[PDB]
Nucleic acid binder design. Sequence first.
RNA 1: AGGCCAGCACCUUUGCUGGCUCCGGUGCGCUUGUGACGGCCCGUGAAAAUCCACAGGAAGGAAUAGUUUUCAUGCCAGGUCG
RNA 2: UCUAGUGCAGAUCUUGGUGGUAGUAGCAAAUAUUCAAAUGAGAACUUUGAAGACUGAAGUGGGGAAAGGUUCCACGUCAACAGCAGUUGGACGUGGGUUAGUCGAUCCUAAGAGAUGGGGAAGCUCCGUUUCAAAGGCCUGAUUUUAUGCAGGCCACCAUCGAAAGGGAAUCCGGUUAAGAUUCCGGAACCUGGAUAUGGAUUCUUCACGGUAACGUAACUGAAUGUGGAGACGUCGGCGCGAGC
RNA 3: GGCGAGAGACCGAUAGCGAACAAGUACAGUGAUGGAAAGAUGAAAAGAACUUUGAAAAGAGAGUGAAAAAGUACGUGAAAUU
RNA 4: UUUGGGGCCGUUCCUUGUCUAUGUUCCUUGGAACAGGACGUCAUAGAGGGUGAGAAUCCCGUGUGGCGAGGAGUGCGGUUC
RNA 5: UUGACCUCAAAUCAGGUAGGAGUACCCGCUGAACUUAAGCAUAUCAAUAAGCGGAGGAAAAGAAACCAACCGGGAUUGCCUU
RNA 6: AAACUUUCAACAACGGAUCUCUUGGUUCUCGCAUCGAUGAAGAACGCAGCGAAAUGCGAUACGUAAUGUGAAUUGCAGAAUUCCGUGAAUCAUCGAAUCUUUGAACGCACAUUGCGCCCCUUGGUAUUCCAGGGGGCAUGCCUGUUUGAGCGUCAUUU
Lengths: 85, 119, 60, 50, 101
Amino acid sequence: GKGTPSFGKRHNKSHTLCNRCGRRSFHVQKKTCSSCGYPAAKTRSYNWGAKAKRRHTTGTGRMRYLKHVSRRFKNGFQTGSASKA
Amino acid sequence: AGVKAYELRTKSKEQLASQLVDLKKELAELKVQKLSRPSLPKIKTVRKSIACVLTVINEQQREAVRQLYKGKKYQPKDLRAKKTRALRRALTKFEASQVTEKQRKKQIAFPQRKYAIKA
Amino acid sequence: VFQVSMKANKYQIKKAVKELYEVDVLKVNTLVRPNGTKKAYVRLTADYDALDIANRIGYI
Amino acid sequence: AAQKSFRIKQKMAKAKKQNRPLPQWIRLRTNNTIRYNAKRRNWRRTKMNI
Amino acid sequence: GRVIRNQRKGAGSIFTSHTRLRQGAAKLRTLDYAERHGYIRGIVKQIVHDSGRGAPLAKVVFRDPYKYRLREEIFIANEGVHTGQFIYAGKKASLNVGNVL
RNA sequence: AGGCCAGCACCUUUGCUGGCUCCGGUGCGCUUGUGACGGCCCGUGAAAAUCCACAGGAAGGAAUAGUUUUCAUGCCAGGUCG
RNA sequence: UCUAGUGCAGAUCUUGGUGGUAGUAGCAAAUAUUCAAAUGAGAACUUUGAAGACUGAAGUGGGGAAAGGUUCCACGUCAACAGCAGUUGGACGUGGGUUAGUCGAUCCUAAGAGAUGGGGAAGCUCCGUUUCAAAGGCCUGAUUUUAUGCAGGCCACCAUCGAAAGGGAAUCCGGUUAAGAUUCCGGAACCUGGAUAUGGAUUCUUCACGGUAACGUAACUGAAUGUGGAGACGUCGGCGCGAGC
RNA sequence: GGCGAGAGACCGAUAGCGAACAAGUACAGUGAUGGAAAGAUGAAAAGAACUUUGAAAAGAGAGUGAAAAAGUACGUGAAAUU
RNA sequence: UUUGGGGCCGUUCCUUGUCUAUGUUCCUUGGAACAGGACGUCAUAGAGGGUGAGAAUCCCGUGUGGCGAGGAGUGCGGUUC
RNA sequence: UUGACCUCAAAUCAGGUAGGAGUACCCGCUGAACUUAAGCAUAUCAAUAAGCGGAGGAAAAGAAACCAACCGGGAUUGCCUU
RNA sequence: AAACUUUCAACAACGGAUCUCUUGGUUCUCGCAUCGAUGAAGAACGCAGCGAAAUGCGAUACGUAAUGUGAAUUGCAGAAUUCCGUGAAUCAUCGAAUCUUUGAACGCACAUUGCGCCCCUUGGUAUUCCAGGGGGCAUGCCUGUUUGAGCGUCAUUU
Ligand SMILES: [Mg+2]
Ligand SMILES: [Mg+2]
Ligand SMILES: [Mg+2]
Ligand SMILES: [Mg+2]
Ligand SMILES: [Mg+2]
Ligand SMILES: [Mg+2]
Ligand SMILES: [Mg+2]
Ligand SMILES: [Mg+2]
Ligand SMILES: [Mg+2]
Ligand SMILES: [Mg+2]
Ligand SMILES: [Mg+2]
Ligand SMILES: [Mg+2]
Ligand SMILES: [Mg+2]
Ligand SMILES: [Mg+2]
Ligand SMILES: [Mg+2]
Ligand SMILES: [Mg+2]
Ligand SMILES: [Mg+2]
Ligand SMILES: [Mg+2]
Ligand SMILES: [Mg+2]
Ligand SMILES: [Mg+2]
Ligand SMILES: [Mg+2]
Ligand SMILES: [Mg+2]
Ligand SMILES: [Mg+2]
Ligand SMILES: [Mg+2]
Ligand SMILES: [Mg+2]
Ligand SMILES: [Mg+2]
Ligand SMILES: [Mg+2]
Ligand SMILES: [Mg+2]
Ligand SMILES: [Mg+2]
Ligand SMILES: [Mg+2]
Ligand SMILES: [Mg+2]
Ligand SMILES: [Mg+2]
Ligand SMILES: [Mg+2]
Ligand SMILES: [Zn+2]
């Protein structure tokens, strides 16, 4: 009975969505994400998980602010406006 | 087509607010037609004109706040400079050029001299 | 029947209808559609005619 | 479930809006390599697991 | 080897006590001033059954000498004690069944 | 109102008009709720939010006028998510 | 002439592809289908009608929780899927559809989880949940520069989370849609919160009368503090009463 | 590692980073994690008007093109197998 | 015996823009000439890419120099207080 | 009585600051085993991997409580060598 | 003798090797130093006239402003004053802004689009109730201010 019949008793979700990573790794009874470690302040990561780091590191998303930092640096973190040459 | 910002910057705050509400009315009147007609790209110009007007209003308000806080320390944290966290925490070129009276005297007495070796 | 911001409540919907269309409101009912938008059924008073102000809004 | 959270409903709405074929003017574009929609999901073939 | 059953009770996961239906801890009244200089009188209101316990408990009501209040106490009932009995607790109390000399 | 009927109308929106809708009985019956009892325990079979009452008597109060809003009536509003 | 990721038949070799087996095994549980018409290119299977049967109310019925997520409904429609078929479909394409003060969530606490204070630990973090803490906010006003401090008094639980079956303020009938309804329409109610005026009641014995009593009434001051009750409770047996059948 | 540049007796789509393409994608797993396949019409769509058989898909003609022995199952088009 | 700090114009560095040669002449093949042949040009440019087939000379560029713009700056080069 | 001092507190007091990401390289803590020894226990693997804390464009180190034994050298780092 | 089996060839199939291509990778070298409470990286939800993705963005939403170039974009539609010009463009540059819900994530919570407190303002005959709008309320630590605590403690009082 440990097979096909026991798979029919599976209707209670151990993990739900995580508010930090949106993944369905948030444990409902432990109150902890299996993937990111929320609510811990540090993001869960391990050097034995190289692919896991590559999946979730910088550059996998939008870089909403960090994209423009190289450009602002190249221009010198200048201030003001251009002046109609 | 749409509005141009250079002919809005000559206007006052109230004129711009009236312009804005009129444009929003036009945008609603266009959204009620978009569902009747198959296509309506005139809505894009109205959206961008609303954006231009709001940008000009924001600029007018921020410059007035700048002039209010002109020439006094402790101005707001959206009118300050953003440069970076580390560069904002770095020592100024005053604090970094500070030296002791001992080192000033030695810099004055024995500076690096300009010497050449021919004769 | 209006499409409504997902952040708007019934107070705001009532006030906005009274503002834009100059109509008194009796009741507001709201649902969130399966497409993620909000739908407002606004029942006006007997003095006003939704049929007469819809074609003024520009749809019928 | 009928008694559901707004979050689950929201993700379901996104999935309903994604459950579309391609528009066919995208196939007429210059330098186009999209033939079909490969991210197509059906409730019978694959579950969302949300 | 494997950790045995008696080693496994100290962690107290499924071996903890089941204290749902217990009325409280059966303690004597705090030894404040009256119980070491004279006596204080209280009254037995009910003798109740305590789950996990063969001995019955007596709910004894005393008065607070410092505040207008009716602090209740849970005694282990002694054989012969009854409802409406006056319990006397303290140094100068009488040698009778139920007293806290 | 709903139900059961009759009659007269029509490309049709289609109806319109009349009536009845009553009086009882039975039970180790079925299901369910409830009441008062009885039996069982070395088993005597949750807690909190919340509401009311009582004790007390602080304080406030009438006569050419006051006090009462656990009586009645009257006005407004009742969000978010499913 | 230089150089090497340089030569395949094997490794139950790797990946991909293809055969024989073979139009073969087989597509046999759940009593059962038949006739006509319509549709259509085409009907054992779609629709309607007629008949014959089954589930047989501890149902193949009507509803729900979890789970699923649009599978609901309509229109169009058959290349693939529905291990025959297919004009049909939980398929394909295009759209429509879920209306609440009274239903739940929301709130309470349960087992339990878990901050703060503090203490451990190189540290990620652990203990512990009222503790060896200087751990707060509640009524009334006084002043009438005036807003709200000082005037007073009171009070000491000491986070928070934890149940869509436990606790819990409050709604019913009729009707309506392709698909929604205790949510919409109509009619008829109720609760909470807040403003409030009139009537009524009471008072010159100031804060009501009657009844021997149990108690009764349209009402008929009441702070702090305190007490009590409800919430709030097993299982089985028979008897009684009611409702629906 | 990040940003910006220049090179190679390197690999050349079963190779080379897992990924030359909507690749950490689709998909699997409660989860930690695991993790693909998939490039080439033609210079130019000029991507086959029109006739005819057929319910239709399609076919046969015609036509475009240098070439349909290039027809969106598209460069060349091996072998097994038919 | 020897001394400090400001300004200005340059230079240094960063970033960026723009300008700066010579055939598309003839015949054959081909759908297309960027192929073949004949005659030439430029070259401090015959690197590379593109264009209907192997293009220095068709296009972008390349090479060589020039003309600007905006900054940072105390490194020095002159002038001024 | 008034006013100081000391130590300790509260404030949505006036101003600031720390956290997290990245982590190739850097400064530290912690810390294996497979493996080699033809077995294995010291040893080796290795003062390595994994785990933890902390930085910058480099970090660290650094102007000798040094090396030496020479006719003495002279912060630190790195290379050739030893 | 046919059929059938086998072998070969031509054509047609199955399949996708080989050949030739390459807006990709890999390695070497060079130069530079720039994330975040002024809210980072990451995540979710949205945004286009007609988009499901990717890419871009945030209710000013495939973008606004500014500057430069100087007439496009393109699959279709539509637009034209935008064309000897403060001006096209899925253009480039980019110094001003916007930047939903979140996240170290900061009012308390979060399996909730939950529950509060303060200031200003508007409305509903309202200091108190309801609602709308705007602005705020984390923790540790430092400097300082103010208010205080303690026979810890000094002096001075009559
Ligand atoms: Mg189970
Ligand atoms: Mg579990
Ligand atoms: Mg609702
Ligand atoms: Mg039953
Ligand atoms: Mg080899
Ligand atoms: Mg082989
Ligand atoms: Mg061999
Ligand atoms: Mg094999
Ligand atoms: Mg057979
Ligand atoms: Mg069989
Ligand atoms: Mg259906
Ligand atoms: Mg079939
Ligand atoms: Mg078929
Ligand atoms: Mg803990
Ligand atoms: Mg709760
Ligand atoms: Mg509940
Ligand atoms: Mg219970
Ligand atoms: Mg319940
Ligand atoms: Mg229904
Ligand atoms: Mg109604
Ligand atoms: Mg009376
Ligand atoms: Mg009780
Ligand atoms: Mg009993
Ligand atoms: Mg050919
Ligand atoms: Mg060909
Ligand atoms: Mg081919
Ligand atoms: Mg062959
Ligand atoms: Mg060994
Ligand atoms: Mg060995
Ligand atoms: Mg061994
Ligand atoms: Mg390590
Ligand atoms: Mg250093
Ligand atoms: Mg040092
Ligand atoms: Zn997570």
